[model samples]
Target: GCHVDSRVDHLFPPSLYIFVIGVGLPTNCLALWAAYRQVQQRNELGVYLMNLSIADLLYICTLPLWVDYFLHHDNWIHGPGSCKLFGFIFYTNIYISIAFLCCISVDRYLAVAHPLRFARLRRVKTAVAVSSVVWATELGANSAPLFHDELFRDRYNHTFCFEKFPMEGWVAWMNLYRVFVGFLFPWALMLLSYRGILRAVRGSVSTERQEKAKIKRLALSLIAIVLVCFAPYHVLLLSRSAIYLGRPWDCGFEERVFSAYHSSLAFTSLNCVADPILYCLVNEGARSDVAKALHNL
Candidate 1:
């Protein structure tokens, strides 16, 4: 029935939508609180984390609109303005979140390897300033397409908010830029930073065994969590881009699979719910708060 209209129904389901709302909210909320209470977060990984949380939470805040539309059987009565705003924010967050995560990984590496210089390099004020820059950059990136595209109402009066004015050469180039600047470059930085951190951490340090274990555990946990959450999404994105470049006109079944995969993977935003846990692990004050919370529970 839904497919008969715009065929967008196959990309989402009721259960999935419910899970996104029910599970994504409280977890991220708790994490946000924990970050405030526990970690210094002014510099280093904490800074990137705070931005990542903001991105995820802000993006998830808009999910109910999508859920309501889906539930109402794809009736997008909200008008084209909303579709553009929400859609742009959603996609922008997807890329920006990954960028921030990569930043976090690098921060962690610097913390371990060049602790003294890393300390000198990091400052809360600086972090805040950089965060502002990030916000502006993402805002510009997301809003750019809205200007060029129509994003008017659809056939079912569903308000199809897509790039109507396809800037072919520019669109393809921008996507490639996203894959490179937004994804691959950051990932490479993270990988290198983690490698350096591991090497440095293996060397001598005066920290107690318990503290060292915790640090190691937290670092590994952050890396593992990101891999589990984002690797599949990136793979699909890369594959889609590669295929499109190879055969731009012939978008067949496999192409549809890629499109579906891309849409479905948007739900991966939820996995960031663990960010507060990471914060608690890294910050002593946050850990104490968690302990109190646990006792109360």
Candidate 2:
């Protein structure tokens, strides 16, 4: 459970975390600044984007500590509280990020599909209220980990942090909860929103070419969110659950699965860095705001 011989699991994350921090911090910070300014100017998309950036920033700030932990061969010198706190931030950000992405998708759908019907729905207050609900829900969902007293401990007389749970029914349920709540349900809603948006865009006679192009670009970026950012980690989660379900696996297979799990976990962290690129590049106003921010510097 310590992954004592698993060099990939132990060594790979710090390196990846280094890259994540180097890129994620400044990008999310700048994006947060710009999005906040836009929110003040009553831009609805900016409200959701600002919260997304905040979630990224909160989690990205915890990476250096994680980097240090992994670099020390999984040793956690910080107390268990620190471990749980950062862990909470890390996992909570993942779903919170997706939740905000869902908000953006629904907002886009309303803007594209039933513009007149929902025109009044796109307001700064509305985004803020939705974001408040998302934050509270994610915070509650992630709070259980903070109270996990066994989160850190001594193994083989070596202090270790965030070791894998022994295969058990609880582990199975935990994985299932994440698969269903964290990935599947949110994924289904996002797909539904996108499907409706696509249908409206395709069937509408009044939509301009530029507007169609924008919708297509946003849709492509959301697709990337599913395919690139969320897919591998969740697939691996299912596999790991199967592994725990007494599925037969030789040592080699277990090793491979464990390695892939770690890699997929690292892959998910890339979303922190990817959000700024995906959202800022696709949204014209966000792009110009980022440019102006850069120009001011």
Candidate 3:
């Protein structure tokens, strides 16, 4: 009964994903390569950024399959297993991407607030270990969708992937967990380190604090990315879950809520493009390496 305009369903994700795939695919492929060089040189931030690139690239690659699904008018030919796996990749990478950003915030905080500590304690090995742990944790947790066996729905001859209506109890709580831990928790870490840096630079000293602008700029951009990319979806998901868990659900209410929720997901599609762009300090070296290599060639 909640089936509204099928056009909106088919239109939004593919349009957004295609645009992002065009930009993100090339940039991230280049990004990881450049970041790989820095990783070899033991740049800790490079490791985080490299993994970020990998996660983004993986998600970017996954979108074409989804694009095919959506373009087929929300029909799936690959069966339920592919649906679940693709959905799992999307969920896993989204949180994994956010987790890395949280780590970078803390990592930068150490670099700025405690240089000696960063040097002595926060080494490249630590970064590598942390990156692996993020993948390990996210891989297991996001697989919950697969375990549930309801990752896809078949009705009216369309194989709907990850669309749960009547608001399943488990899914409602799952959305709550994602909002609190997946988005909000990491955002708190981001702000804590970010706020500390702002305070540190603003008053600690004036003369040589000039060069601290990059740290200031980078952190703000990352925060902005999260605000733009993840905030809408999480906020609306919380709303949807709250309404679902609070009472039953009105189809009209759920319909609009679900539409907004899906549209908000398109916002996250831009994140793939943003990471490779905003985090382009990796690009700075990444691009130069390209320019340098071409000149040599």
Candidate 4:
């Protein structure tokens, strides 16, 4: 599944991978520090974002190797085990990050809107349990590839990692699960959460203008970031899966489609950078806190 002679892959994969690592690394590590402080204060949202910072930090940590892989024209020199590990880390973190964001939006909605109702639901213990379930469930499910022998496939003198083409029946079915279960459902949860948040802020009597302003701004940013970072990648995955499942392809068309899909995956890693930025965006009075954080340095 590894081919060197592609326009989109060469242009976006290595270039964005390098940039994401450079930008995503320090920010997420700093977000990790910020989250630890919040969690120390027993903040429930911090629990969700603390796990987010963990996932994002791991997300970018794995990218430097990928930068090497793509820069060297899609070559992986560390054999299949190394390939398997790197592949697993990169894929699992995306879903983990998405799951955390879902937790956060719902947490925010309950805190801001349904203050009287479900108030007890927004506790640190619930956040911990939900986060644990997310990590365990996502890690166990996404590790489907490790059980397979197809991690490293040789083609054109290059070793490809998790870049299966012709979409094996198993892989296509897994994509179905991924698109619906991992992606669409989580997306729906976030969208509904934020929409309700905005509605709650719009008419609520207690929230002042500035507070409502920040809530509205953050709500808009969440929806936009979802579409910008993940929507493209998952949409293409769905398309490719549909094609592989039952439709007829005209030979060369498969490469073109997958090339687009792989290239769009570079966009998914774009989320690594977005995570820390979203951290600052979503936090209440975050500007002053970040300002204080800077001065404390």
TM-score of each: 0.77, 0.88, 0.90, 0.91
Positional deviation of residue 117's Cα in model 3 after best superposition, in angstroms: 1.6
| Residue-by-residue lDDT tens digits, candidate 3, 1-297 | 344345576788889989999989877876776777777777788899899999998899888988887778767678668888888887678899999988888887888776656475477898989999998987876666878764455345566677666667888888898899888999899999998877667655653655567657767877988888999988888887887788765756676665577678877888889887777534367678645654776
Compared with the true structure, model 4 gives a TM-score of: 0.91
Cα lDDT of model 2 by residue, 131-219, tens digit: 99999988887666566653555344345445453444565677678788877888778888898998888888788888888877778
Tens digits of lDDT, candidate 4, 81-133: 87888888987788898888888988988987687788578788988998999
- Greater TM-score among 3 and 4 belongs to 4
Q: Rank the candidates by lDDT, best first.
A: 4, 3, 2, 1
lDDT of 2: 0.77
Local error of candidate 3 at 62, Å? 0.6
Q: What value does the lDDT take at residue 32 in candidate 1?
A: 61
Which pairs clash inside model 2? none
Inter-residue clash pairs, candidate 1: 38-286
In candidate 3, which residue pairs get closer than 3 Å at backbone N, Cα or C atoms, i.e. clash?
Answer: 280-283
Assess candidate 1 and give its TM-score to the true structure: 0.77
User: What lDDT score goes with residue 116 in model 3?
Assistant: 58
The local lDDT score (0 to 100) that residue 79 gets in candidate 3 is 69
> Model 1, residue 278: displacement in angstroms?
4.0
> lDDT scores for all predictions?
0.62, 0.77, 0.78, 0.79
Please give, for residues 127-214, the per-residue lDDT of candidate 1 as tens digits: 5676778778767765666776535443444443443211144555666777677767766777778778777877856777787777
Candidate 4 lDDT at 263 equals: 79
lDDT of 3: 0.78
